[PDB]
XYZ file of C-alpha atoms in Angstrom:
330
model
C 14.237 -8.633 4.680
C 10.687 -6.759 4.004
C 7.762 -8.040 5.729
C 5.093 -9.471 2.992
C 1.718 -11.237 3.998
C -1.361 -11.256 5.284
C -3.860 -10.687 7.678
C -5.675 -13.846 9.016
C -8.978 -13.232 11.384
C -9.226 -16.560 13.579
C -9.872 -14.564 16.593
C -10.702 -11.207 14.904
C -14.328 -10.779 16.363
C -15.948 -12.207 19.428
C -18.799 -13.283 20.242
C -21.097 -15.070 23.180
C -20.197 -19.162 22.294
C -18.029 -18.524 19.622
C -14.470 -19.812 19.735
C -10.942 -18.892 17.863
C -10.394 -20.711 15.172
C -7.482 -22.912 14.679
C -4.612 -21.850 12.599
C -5.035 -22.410 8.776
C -2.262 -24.462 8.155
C -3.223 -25.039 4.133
C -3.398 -20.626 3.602
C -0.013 -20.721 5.871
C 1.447 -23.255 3.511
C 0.343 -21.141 0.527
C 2.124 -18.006 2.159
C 5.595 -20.014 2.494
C 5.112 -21.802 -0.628
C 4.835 -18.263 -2.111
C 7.406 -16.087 -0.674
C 5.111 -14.582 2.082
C 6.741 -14.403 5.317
C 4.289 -11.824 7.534
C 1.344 -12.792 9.498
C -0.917 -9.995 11.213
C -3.181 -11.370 13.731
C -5.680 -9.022 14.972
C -7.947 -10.006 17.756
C -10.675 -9.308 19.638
C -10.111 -9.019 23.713
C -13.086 -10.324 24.805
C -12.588 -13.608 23.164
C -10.154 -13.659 27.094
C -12.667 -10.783 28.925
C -15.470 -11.575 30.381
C -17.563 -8.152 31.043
C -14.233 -5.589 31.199
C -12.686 -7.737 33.734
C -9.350 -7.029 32.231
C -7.118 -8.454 35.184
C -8.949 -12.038 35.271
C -7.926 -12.918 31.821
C -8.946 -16.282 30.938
C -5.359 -17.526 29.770
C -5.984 -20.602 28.587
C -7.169 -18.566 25.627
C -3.903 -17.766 24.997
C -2.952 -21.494 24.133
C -4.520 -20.242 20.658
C -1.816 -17.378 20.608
C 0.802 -19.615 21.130
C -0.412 -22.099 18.357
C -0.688 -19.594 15.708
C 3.263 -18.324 16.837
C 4.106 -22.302 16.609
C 2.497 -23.033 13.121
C 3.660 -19.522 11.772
C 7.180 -20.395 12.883
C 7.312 -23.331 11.664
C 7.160 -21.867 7.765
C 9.405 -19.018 8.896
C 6.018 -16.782 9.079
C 6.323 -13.822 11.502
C 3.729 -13.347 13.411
C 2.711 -10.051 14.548
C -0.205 -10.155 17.110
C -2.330 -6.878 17.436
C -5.063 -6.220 19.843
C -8.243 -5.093 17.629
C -10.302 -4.633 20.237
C -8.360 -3.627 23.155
C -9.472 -2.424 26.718
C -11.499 0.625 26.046
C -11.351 0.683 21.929
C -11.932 -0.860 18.580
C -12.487 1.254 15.597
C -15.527 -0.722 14.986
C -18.868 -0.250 16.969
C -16.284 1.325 19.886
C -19.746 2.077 21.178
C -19.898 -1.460 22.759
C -16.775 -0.920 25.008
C -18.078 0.395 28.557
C -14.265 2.559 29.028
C -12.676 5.034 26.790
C -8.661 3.830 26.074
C -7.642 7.266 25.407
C -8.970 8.375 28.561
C -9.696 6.432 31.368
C -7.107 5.284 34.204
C -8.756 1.773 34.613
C -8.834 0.698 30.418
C -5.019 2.159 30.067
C -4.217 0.091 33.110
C -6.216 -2.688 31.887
C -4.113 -2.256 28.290
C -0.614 -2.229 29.259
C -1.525 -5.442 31.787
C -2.893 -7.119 28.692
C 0.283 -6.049 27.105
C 2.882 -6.964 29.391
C 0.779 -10.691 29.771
C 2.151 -11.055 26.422
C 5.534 -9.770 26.893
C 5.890 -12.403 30.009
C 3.979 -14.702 28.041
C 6.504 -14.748 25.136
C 9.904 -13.366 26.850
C 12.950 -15.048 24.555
C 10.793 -15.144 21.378
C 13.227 -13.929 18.107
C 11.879 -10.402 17.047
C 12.326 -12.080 14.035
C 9.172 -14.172 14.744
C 6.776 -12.129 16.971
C 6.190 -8.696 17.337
C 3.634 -6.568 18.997
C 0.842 -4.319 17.220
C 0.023 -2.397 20.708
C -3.622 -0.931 19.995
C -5.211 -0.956 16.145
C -6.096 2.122 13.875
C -6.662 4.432 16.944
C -8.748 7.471 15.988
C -8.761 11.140 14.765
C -7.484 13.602 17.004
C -10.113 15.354 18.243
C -12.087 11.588 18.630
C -12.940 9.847 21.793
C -10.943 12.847 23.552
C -7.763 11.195 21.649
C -4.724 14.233 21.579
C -1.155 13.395 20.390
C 0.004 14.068 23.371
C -2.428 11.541 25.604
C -1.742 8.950 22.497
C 1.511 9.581 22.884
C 1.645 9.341 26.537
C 0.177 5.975 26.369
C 2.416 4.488 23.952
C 5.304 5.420 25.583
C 3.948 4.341 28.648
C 2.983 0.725 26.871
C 6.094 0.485 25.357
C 8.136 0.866 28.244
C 5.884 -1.483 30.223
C 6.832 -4.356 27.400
C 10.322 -3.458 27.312
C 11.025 -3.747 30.720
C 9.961 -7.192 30.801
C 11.478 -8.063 27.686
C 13.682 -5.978 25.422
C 14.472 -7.593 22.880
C 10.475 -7.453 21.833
C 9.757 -5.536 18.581
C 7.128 -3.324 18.929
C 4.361 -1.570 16.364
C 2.485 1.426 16.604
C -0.694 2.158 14.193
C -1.070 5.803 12.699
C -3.749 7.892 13.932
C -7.195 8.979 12.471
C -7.619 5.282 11.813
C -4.189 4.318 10.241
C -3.750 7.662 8.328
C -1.910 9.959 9.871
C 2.175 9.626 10.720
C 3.555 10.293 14.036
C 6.588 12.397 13.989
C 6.159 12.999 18.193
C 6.880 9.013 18.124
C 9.654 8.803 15.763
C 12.272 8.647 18.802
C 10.418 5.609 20.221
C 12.188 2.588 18.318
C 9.211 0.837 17.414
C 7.663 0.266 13.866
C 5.242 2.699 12.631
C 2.213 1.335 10.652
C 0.591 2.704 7.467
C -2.495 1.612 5.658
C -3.085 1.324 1.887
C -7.072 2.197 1.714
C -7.108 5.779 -0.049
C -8.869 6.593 -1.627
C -11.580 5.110 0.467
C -14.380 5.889 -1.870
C -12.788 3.112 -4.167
C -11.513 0.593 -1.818
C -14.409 0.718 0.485
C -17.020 1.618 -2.024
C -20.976 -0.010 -0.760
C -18.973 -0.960 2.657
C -21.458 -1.030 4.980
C -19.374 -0.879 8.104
C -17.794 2.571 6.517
C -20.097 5.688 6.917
C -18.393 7.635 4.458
C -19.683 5.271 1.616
C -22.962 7.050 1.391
C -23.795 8.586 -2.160
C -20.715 7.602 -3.511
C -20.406 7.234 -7.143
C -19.472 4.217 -9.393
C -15.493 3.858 -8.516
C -13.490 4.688 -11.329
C -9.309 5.427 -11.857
C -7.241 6.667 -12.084
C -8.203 10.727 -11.072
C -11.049 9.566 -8.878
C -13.253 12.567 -7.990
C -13.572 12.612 -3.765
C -14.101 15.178 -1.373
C -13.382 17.611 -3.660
C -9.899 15.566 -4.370
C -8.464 14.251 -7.488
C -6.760 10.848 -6.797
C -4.179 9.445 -8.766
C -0.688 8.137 -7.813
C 0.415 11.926 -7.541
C -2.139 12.157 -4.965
C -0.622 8.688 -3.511
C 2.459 10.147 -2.883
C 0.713 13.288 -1.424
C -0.881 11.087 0.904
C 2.268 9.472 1.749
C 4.752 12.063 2.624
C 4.640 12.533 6.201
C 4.886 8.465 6.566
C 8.043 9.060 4.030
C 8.974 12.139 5.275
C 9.880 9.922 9.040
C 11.021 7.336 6.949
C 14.062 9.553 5.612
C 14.489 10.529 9.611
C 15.557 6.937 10.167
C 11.694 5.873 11.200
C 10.410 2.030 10.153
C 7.500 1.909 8.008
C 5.177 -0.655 6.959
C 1.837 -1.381 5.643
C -0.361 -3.178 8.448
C -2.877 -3.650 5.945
C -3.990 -2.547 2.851
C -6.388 -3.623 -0.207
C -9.869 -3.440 -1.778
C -13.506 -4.430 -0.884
C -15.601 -6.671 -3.683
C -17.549 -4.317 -5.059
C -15.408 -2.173 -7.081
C -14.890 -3.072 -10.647
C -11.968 -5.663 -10.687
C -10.150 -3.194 -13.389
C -10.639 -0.761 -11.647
C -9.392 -2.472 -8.293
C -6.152 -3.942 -10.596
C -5.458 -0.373 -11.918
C -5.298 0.981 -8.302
C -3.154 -1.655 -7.007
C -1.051 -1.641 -9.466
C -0.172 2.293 -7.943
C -0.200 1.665 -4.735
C 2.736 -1.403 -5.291
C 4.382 0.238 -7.296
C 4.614 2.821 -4.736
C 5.891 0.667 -2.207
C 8.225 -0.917 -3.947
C 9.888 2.552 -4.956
C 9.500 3.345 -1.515
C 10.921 -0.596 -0.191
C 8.351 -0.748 1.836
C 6.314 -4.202 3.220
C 2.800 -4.628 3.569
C -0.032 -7.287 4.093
C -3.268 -7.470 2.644
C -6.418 -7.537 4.610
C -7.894 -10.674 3.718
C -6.006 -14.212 2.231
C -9.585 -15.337 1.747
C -12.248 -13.115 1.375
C -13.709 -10.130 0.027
C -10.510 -7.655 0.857
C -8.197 -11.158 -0.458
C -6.407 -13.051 -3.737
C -8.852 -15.995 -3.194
C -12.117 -15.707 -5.214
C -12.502 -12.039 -3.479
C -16.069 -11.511 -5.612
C -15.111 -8.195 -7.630
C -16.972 -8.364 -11.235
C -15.040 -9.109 -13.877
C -12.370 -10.898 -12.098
C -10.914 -14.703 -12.691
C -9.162 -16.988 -10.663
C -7.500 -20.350 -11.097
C -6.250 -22.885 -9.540
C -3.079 -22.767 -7.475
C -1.049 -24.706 -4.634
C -4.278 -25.510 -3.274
C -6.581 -22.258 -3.476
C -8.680 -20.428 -6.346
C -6.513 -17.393 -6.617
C -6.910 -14.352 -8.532
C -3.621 -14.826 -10.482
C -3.258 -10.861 -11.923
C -3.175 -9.824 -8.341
C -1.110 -12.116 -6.454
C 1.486 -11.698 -9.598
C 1.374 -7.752 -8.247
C 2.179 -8.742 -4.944
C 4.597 -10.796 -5.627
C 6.096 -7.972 -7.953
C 6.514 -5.529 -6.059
C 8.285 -6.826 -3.476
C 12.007 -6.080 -3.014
């Protein structure tokens, strides 16, 4: 069975007094009542770290983990945790981290300790139920001093770590140059490798403020959406595509971590690009989980002009689009 769902943020990004939220039971009930059945939970390390003091974790925190796994099981949800922000990295404002993951001795060892917590934490846990996004979207090669052969190292190293404590634990490994590029070096590994569904950025990210690239970009239109010098269409999709498909053939899992479009792109435009990108991974049976349930990147009142949303099992949804989800799963 394909893994379909969401991401959920609840302890996505820290901050000084702020605490995780509880699990949203109602959204989770919408997911089972739906046919979803995948839960990404990226969080932020710090919401357990005080100043980098990765071996002093505050684990009480981690009663939080363990009541998201409960309430996620519960509706036959798996739940697949991720660090966001790990020891030394975060895609976003990585600036604020005082170690470099990709680098540094003390943030790797910091990592896999972080890591095998969990793996301790959760020994006996079904695979079927939990599994382990090790370190998210890590960056370009050439970034941060980030090679495929110190990524590489790392994972390996990581995945070893978990494994020797428990198993049986399924693990999942993000692309590089921020969920973009395959990883044939890792196909060996056993572990899940994670794609992204955000190309062409200049539509799904268009007036994202927290994306650099959006500067001077044009009104979003598709399909053949003019962008670096690139025409995008589904052609260009499956361009994209073939290395992740290419592993795929070699025996290699693939999924889609996450995937969607920001609220400021025409809604048919949004809707016309979604409906390639599905149909693409359906063709391909792949899975994949939207970034947002609720909010701008989600199927309940996301914001994009021109959309409509009604009523349903509890939430405002946008109907067209969660009709394409459910669509295009096999």
């Amino acid at each position: 069975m394909k893994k379909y769902g969401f991401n959920f943020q609840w302890m996505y990004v820290w901050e000084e007094g702020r605490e995780p939220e509880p699990p949203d039971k109602k959204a989770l009930d919408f997911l089972a009542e739906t046919g979803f059945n995948f839960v990404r939970i990226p969080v932020d390390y710090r919401f357990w770290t005080r100043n980098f003091d990765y071996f002093n974790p505050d684990k009480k925190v981690f009663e939080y983990i363990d009541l998201y796994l409960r309430e996620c099981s519960a509706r036959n949800i798996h739940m697949c945790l991720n660090l966001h922000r790990a020891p030394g990295y975060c895609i976003n404002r990585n600036d604020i981290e005082r170690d470099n993951l990709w680098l540094d001795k003390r943030a790797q060892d910091g990592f896999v300790y972080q890591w095998e917590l969990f793996a301790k934490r959760y020994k006996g846990v079904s695979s079927k139920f939990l599994s382990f996004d090790l370190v998210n979207e890590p960056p370009n090669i050439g970034q941060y001093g980030l090679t495929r052969e110190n990524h590489a190292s790392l994972i390996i190293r990581t995945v070893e770590a978990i494994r020797k404590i428990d198993p049986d634990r399924e693990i999942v490994i993000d692309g590089l140059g921020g969920g973009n590029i395959a990883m044939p070096e890792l196909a060996h590994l056993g572990v899940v490798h994670s794609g992204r569904g955000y190309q062409p950025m200049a539509l799904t990210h268009y007036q994202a403020s927290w994306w650099d690239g959006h500067k001077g970009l044009p009104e979003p239109y598709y399909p053949d959406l003019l962008w670096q010098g690139k025409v995008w269409n589904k052609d260009t999709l499956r361009e994209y595509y073939k290395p992740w498909r290419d592993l795929q053939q070699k025996g290699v899992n693939v999924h889609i971590g996450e995937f969607g479009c920001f609220n400021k792109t025409s809604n048919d435009v949004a809707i016309r690009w979604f409906e390639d990108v599905l149909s693409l991974y359906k063709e391909f049976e792949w899975g994949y989980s939207l970034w947002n349930f609720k909010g701008p990147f989600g199927i309940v009142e996301h914001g994009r002009p021109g959309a409509k949303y009604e009523y349903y099992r509890g939430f405002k949804v946008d109907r067209e689009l969660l009709d394409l989800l459910v669509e295009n799963r096999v």
